[PDB]
Amino acid sequence: PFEIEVLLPGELSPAETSALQKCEGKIITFSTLRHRASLVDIALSSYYINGAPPDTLSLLEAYRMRFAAVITRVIPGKLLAHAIGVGTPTPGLFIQNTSPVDLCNGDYICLLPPVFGSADSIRLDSVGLEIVFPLTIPQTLMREIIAKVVARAVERTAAGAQILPHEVLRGADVICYNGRRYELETNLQHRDGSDAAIRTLVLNLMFSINEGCLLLLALIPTLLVRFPIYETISSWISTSSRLGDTLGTRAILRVCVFDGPSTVHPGDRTAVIQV
């Protein structure tokens, strides 16, 4: 069984130690797998690129390019973890729910960057670094969640751009799972993450669809009864393939509960199996 030991720093405040101990079954993400590592690899500081803090697109790409692990137990002077990597037979692997939606038996686990609300995370001001944890969600909901957030962004952009708004609508977007609705982003104000972390994402997702469903028409005008024309096709194919590889869906864990409560709520810890 492969395990990682994260070295706890010296001279840490007791409130911070307790806050860390509270986060028992949480997913951390390591760049290169090694038995001994430091807190700089776990902190957000290792995730940001080009100097600026990371984007949602950057986080989605890092979640693929980077390896994962789960915290197993916290010691007043040490911190351990177990990988979900190569072949390790981790016994008694348990995970704590971080998403507002519920989970049941036989659901597969997938990772996301925080999109709904502000990410909750530990932050040591003594050392001066924060440790953000990725959201865990079932598989059947992530496609819908991504589509809805991009649609909300594009609708906001369109309402801003058009001289007049087309406000007439159905109410508010909702996500229902296990007979429980979420009702995300009630108010129009509080543009916290409207264009803070999904800006480049929505830009690229608009551009690719525009290119595609304009090039089809430009190539064949029969549909509705000086110029390269080939580098365009090349670039479109390349961009579409890269964006699809980025916005993938790959299950990482399966919730297997034995002799326990089937449905679990945000905050409970459940034993899972390595897929």
Partner: protein, 48 residues
Amino acid sequence: FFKQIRSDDNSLYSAQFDILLGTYCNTLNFVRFLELGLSVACICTKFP
């Protein structure tokens, strides 16, 4: 303070102590006036 564990949930096999690695101090010395070479610059005497 009250708490009870179901059967066995670790949290007991966590022997973590603190050790003291000894102390170190210093003892200053005392300098006498006549032992210095400056005593040959004057003649000192005691007058109660």
